[PDB]
């Protein structure tokens, strides 16, 4: 019941899985992208927002620089679920240009 991504609890290990999951894969699935939501959404309850802003901005530069535009939407999809559960906790959100 902890914020882990594909079995990765450490931030360095998380960002590493995303970087590759965004490079080795151009056509992500709803299930795969969902795994990211449960991870970020957990940071809110675990109070690990510190890594949140790090993972968000990290995956952003990737989903943005990615050749597939579909990645741009994936980012919003995760935020639509995370930013929601995060607001109900603190009320604030992340600043994404």
């Amino acid at each position: 019941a902890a914020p882990n991504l594909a079995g990765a609890v450490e931030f360095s290990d998380v960002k590493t899985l995303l970087k590759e999951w965004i490079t080795t894969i151009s056509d992500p699935m709803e299930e795969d992208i969902l795994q990211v939501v449960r991870y970020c959404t957990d940071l809110i309850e675990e109070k690990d927002l510190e890594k949140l802003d790090l993972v968000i901005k990290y995956m952003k530069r990737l989903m943005q620089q990615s050749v597939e535009s579909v990645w741009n939407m994936a980012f919003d999809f995760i935020l639509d679920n995370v930013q929601v559960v995060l607001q109900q906790t603190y009320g604030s959100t992340l600043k994404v240009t």
Binding site: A6, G7, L17, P28, M29, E31, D32, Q35
Partner: peptide, 14 residues
């Protein structure tokens, strides 16, 4: 099916 599933199972498996 999901990349995170086949990847997470890879480390867990041996």
């Amino acid at each position: 099916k999901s990349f995170f599933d086949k990847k997470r199972s890879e480390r867990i498996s041996n």
